């Protein structure tokens, strides 16, 4: 029948007698009220991983089956609330009523159903949008040491997504409750929680909930992908998902593989990330772009989980600990950060100034290793000094305030065409702040032009309009 | 024939109990198709491969599709044979999964079509042939300096961003365009996005009906990833057996075939070995790579891309594959940072079919002088870096001038680069490859600037480009 | 004397540059052997864990 | 309904409770027995429950040595977790893991309320995020890595760098600054240091508003593991009822992680990484997450960590690093240089060094100090092996001030009274930040570098030189 | 016993590592779940039961002492291994001897860089 | 058969390292616990039970002979690995063939310092 | 072999010379037959009772007052790694030890004796 009795309790694992008509993956609810996924239907003893606190359960407590596969309730109600992976709220705003439920484990869209990617996802980070383009349906990996500003880049990406209908998601994996609260209050302050959901399972929660948190995160995004609105999914850290799965596997007695991870780790991560791709015009042209984050000890990217994940994703963005502690913010390394789908989604206006900027950073980064002498060669070497110095000044950004696209294009054009070359190096930043407001007042025709054409402003009056700002700057 | 019931599910692995004693053989196939009796159940359609016997009539299997929603006590039927792929002309120009069903919505194959077992005992020692024929691909670097041969397993190795799928498309198209060589593609563990990109790059190149395709991707359970590689083989075996003609077989990544085997072995429950691989690494690898052959009727020459797991060739999987391979081409990132494409290093690339007689003592002697020239350049630029160019005499100076011409002329212009850069493309037969390089090796053509050679088909194309440039 | 002191600072600059190149190459070879030795030790440890796990 | 012991294997024991009466996990058990015959030994022992087993049996861990345990002894079930007495009564006393007082001052009455060690953590609704800079009175910590209330703080070092000397100077300065409760836990602490610290705090009279928990190294591993949670349950009563900032100090948590690894191996689980148990992040998170700033008040904590071999990628430091809000690194080279507490200016980091939290001037001052010391760190080898006169006069200025800065981060200490006898003193934040503004301005550059060691104000530096007569 | 009478005592254990190995072999033959290397999980407790009897009793207890000098032989300059890290965590100091120092003429070879004494300074005579 | 009858013989085994790998694969399909590099200890007895049937019988037995030339494959020249040294203990010499010279044009090359014969002098003709 | 040398040094009282050709193969043969006997592996697959049984044999080979034995032994290090258990347990028992190292032998220096690591009472 439906009922069965628990007859062992490990460190979050359990085993149960009865449950004869159970099926693999079925959600099971214990008498206490916590629920568990029936991983293994062995000959007489069902393995029953417990999600939540397990201390209350004793041998002989009743365990019963819901009747359903592992699923998260979804709907339009969730947007603006904070829920745990199983889909219950933690914010305190009351119950949430959702009328639809989606299985967390599903077949992805097949190779007939997908498409090529061609419409860009404007972050408002200057260096990402200029040099490492992303587009709806791309899978893109942000990688680097701890305390490198990665979550700042995520929150900058989830704000500045207002007019674009990017229903977004943030998944908190193992995170500190104080930082989850701090981020939720930062979203609430910037008026950005109308269009986003937040999912949390924290370190006090046992490891199976951390392991399930990314799958339920993508399962929320699939409602929007089916219907046709764009989506973005962000994971706070995938490496902690790998550690939660390792703990879960070893308590189940499976033997380790290379470097003491199980080998099933590549199937886990490749299953999770390769559901993020753009659907065809026949099926609604939706999307589900994703931003995995992963951390590297000492900054060595050649370790097991990094190279495993870098194989699945379509690019990498590398955040330098060395630059970030030197204070260059946000810190992105031009040599080691690149994307495969990029170069197509990027807008035509940006493409002209992006290629020149890419060569400028590539050439300055090596030449800076020799730069400190001041007098070395004639101006030919120095021009690369002068351009690289102004380039690195322009690519820094203030903390947590995201930039608008048509002014982003216009500042990169101003940089890459050489109008800044006379302007003294010490005051290069102040030029951007004054320019953004002035260009709105006096330059609106250029903003309309870019919004009209996807193309650089009509070049004839472009110099004159920029010159009036250059004079207005003092 | 007979009907069983499931008695364990432990992930992909399922154990089955055959009451009559009419048990199935190893590598046989069993099917579950079920529709819900009550509102609590789920509807399912499943193929199982048998992998061990375990006593008391129980059998251990590995599933080719996910096991979610399997009950205990759900029934199975016995097909009576290995997983059977369709073979004939009815599988040309179309894309299939591991079971042989079409991924494309274009249509499906009728019940009249004959089917071959995937698992079949290898060809005998009497049936092989010793005669070695060069496969003439038309790629200048590969044909000059690491000639591929019929029946030969060939390996592509290189860095994460070099050209591998670009070259696999470039070879496919060249063979189909001119040689007309009917050829099969298997994808193991590559991104589904590129699966659809390759389909549209085929359609754009016009090479579509001639080839056939099977896919098993990273979303598949490990058993399906393992057996898709053998489906591609079974289609090429039909082409060189019954239609009795030359074939070419592509596998996109062989390492994930080994890795999927390690994951299955752990689910099966057999002890790890070495760096955690399964016990049976060399035999499972060998049984695939031993069927690729040049028997008395026709060959199945194969190009395979290999990823070294951690840059460690000494690791068990690359070493075991590396023992079967006959010709190896190495693709290099430090070349691809320049305009040189495909970024093939001649110094690393090797062939056991560069036998002086087989290529021809004229092709042999020209090829050795090219390799000697590039090896001397490799050391000579270190001498220039530590001492200087002005520290070297005239002949050494001429060798560096010639080595710059060789490296740029080895680059070529091709159809896949029409999407990337829009240049039309070129084709070169092997006799033209050797003729042109012989004339460059004499050096009378050294008046054209190094800039002229950057991407070209024939020395006469260099002549057209140079004068026009100025 | 001016050319002698200038050429001394050139000779020291090039000698120190080449010496840095030799130091870098050696560090690379040593790092490869250290990585191989550590990975060998870790794979032995994992083999002992498996041998204990089946033996019990 | 009392259990019977059925196996003994060192620390681990097994108890067969009559079914229907089984304890929960993390429940507590008593053995009290008096010997019937001469051969037997009297025992008073408590066990905790750690997992359930196949039928009736429960697997348990022992908090005192199992020597003399017969098979078939009666075990009493408390029906509850290990219960720690909580109140104001504990101020001044020293306790074992089970809540009995180790010191001979007296015995806590049975009538008082006791709170369980194990309780669910603070919820998402209840948590808050106030920010205030915690004035510790320690010139490095206040200048270069400002501490904050509500948060976990970390001290990382090797062996013998000053971790305990510094933790004593914290306890003393906080007892002067506020009558805020402190709780000190010596988790796996050497029985020698326990005598040193108990008598130092009794003799300076700092113990009137503090409590102490000890578990020595000669305790079973389970008793080493549960001592940190006793300290937590005491600090939690003072926050929830008194509603005031109550510091929790833990002497070294490295021993706590290792006690968990040993308990897992005794329970028969399989190791991972460098042999740490499977559940490393879970247990440590369970501890660390209770340290918080909910609406009633705070439980800010300062913890120290041993880093085994100066490589920080070992699991216990690496797993700890994410939870900690601000971390200062202690390096033995400075301690042997005789400048204390040995904390590295370049390697210390905090969240609180931003103008919105700490202050505008404090941000500009701290970044000028770190840039000065970083420029000194890259100038010493040129100073060593070229002539020191070859350094440019601007770099010579950076050298001279970096010498003074490096010394004036040293401070005279109350805890030095035992080791060297000098008085020491306490410095408010304003005087640290202004004094460094005086250092960086440079008018005081005439006073000699030797004066700057072991002082609390720039006026003290004038006095010490005055004794030298400068 | 001599310390309880009140006379100072010194105990030397000529190699603790061989004691640990005898425990390993004894436990493995008893079929006890093993751990890192194969040392049984009890090892740190067994050595702490040995090394925490050493004391300096108070004047109320007689003023005695029991200083102890355990020795551990490390394999090839090994460190971060299981027995050495256990014992290095228990003891209030450690002396590390270097083979490459010995064959260079320093005797007895003692590395001042890696050897520490937490008690140090207090024990010495004032002149020292 | 030939050596006992009285004639000479020569055996080549085209690779013994694949024999060792096949024994490892069989041993772990059985439930036997691994050793160095997962090879069981039985690998020395297997090869030794193979190679010392090669002999030079004496006149009382019939004067036959059975020289055997086994081959082993090194991975990146690691002659210090387990199976190379295992077999090198059993055989009466070694020839080490070098890639570095071979791909520097010295087809073939022998590394003199690694290759030795223990039956030298006795086997050669006197002129040699 | 040892029982013979024992009788001659006791009963006859002559000084005796004992040679054992390779004593490592005694411990290795124990490693083979121990796992089948049924006892768990140790630090690299060796039997549990490594040091007790090897010490039991080596402690018999002693020069009592009745008559001296000198005994010369060789030990094959399982690889060029001395940190292996079987070399490690037997380095204690020997009064004078000679270390032969491959790197010197390849230079052509014979006998290849390690000057720095040779120790004798
Ligand atoms: N443009 C910027 N200007 C000033 N500060 C910055 C800027 N970008 C990032 N930061 C700082 O970088 C720090 C990095 O912390 P973040 O919030 O990203 O946590 P993290 O780097 O992910 O580390 P962890 O994952 O361990 O919490 C943040 O304090 C943030 O204030
Ligand atoms: N012949 C070529 N002409 C122009 N560009 C090329 C050529 N070959 C390679 N490239 C460049 O290098 C890239 C290689 O892309 P490709 O599809 O081969 O990836 P890949 O190495 O197969 O990826 P994976 O290894 O993950 O399968 C191209 O996108 C292009 O930018
Ligand atoms: N201010 C100081 N003056 C003199 N000696 C000191 C001072 N600070 C530390 N020391 C010496 O350095 C030692 C540091 O050891 P400590 O950090 O207390 O070890 P542990 O952290 O293991 O208890 C002290 O015991 C003392 O000998
Ligand atoms: Mg973060
Ligand atoms: Mg590809
Ligand atoms: Mg301490």
Residue numbers in the entry:
A (entry chain A): 26 to 499
B (entry chain E): 1 to 470
C (entry chain G): 232 to 287
D (entry chain D): 2 to 471
E (entry chain C), F (entry chain B): 248 to 375
G (entry chain F): 232 to 352
What does the paper say about this structure?
To address this problem, we froze and imaged TF1 in a temperature-sensitive dwell state detected in single-molecule rotation assays of TF1. These studies have shown that, when rotation of TF1 is observed below 10 °C, the enzyme preferentially dwells at the ATP-binding angle. Due to the temperature-sensitive nature of this dwell, we term this state the “binding-dwell (TS)” hereafter. A mutation in the catalytic site, βE190D in TF1, has been shown to substantially extend the duration of the binding-dwell (TS). Hence, as structural studies only provide a static snapshot of a given molecule at any one time, imaging TF1(βE190D) while it undergoes ATP hydrolysis at 10 °C would facilitate observation of the enzyme stalled in the binding-dwell (TS) state. The predominant structure obtained at 10 °C showed features distinct from the catalytic-dwell structure observed at 28 °C. Two of the β-subunits assumed conformations that are in-between the closed and open forms, whereas the third assumed a closed conformation. We term these β-subunit conformations “half-open” and “half-closed” as the subunit would be transitioning to an open or closed state, respectively, when operating under ATP hydrolysis. All three β-subunits had nucleotide bound, with these being ATP, ATP, and ADP + Pi, with the Coulomb density corresponding to ADP + Pi being elongated compared to the other ATP molecules seen in the other sites. These observations are also consistent with the expected site occupancy of the binding-dwell (TS) suggested by single-molecule experiments: the β-subunit at 0° represents the state after ATP binding, but before the ATP binding 80° stroke, the β-subunit at 120° has ATP tightly bound and the β-subunit at 240° represents the post-hydrolysis state, with ADP + Pi bound. Therefore, we conclude that the predominant structure observed when frozen from 10 °C represents the binding-dwell (TS), pausing at the binding-dwell angle. Starting at 0°—the binding-dwell (TS) state—β0∘HCTP is in the half-closed conformation with MgATP bound loosely.
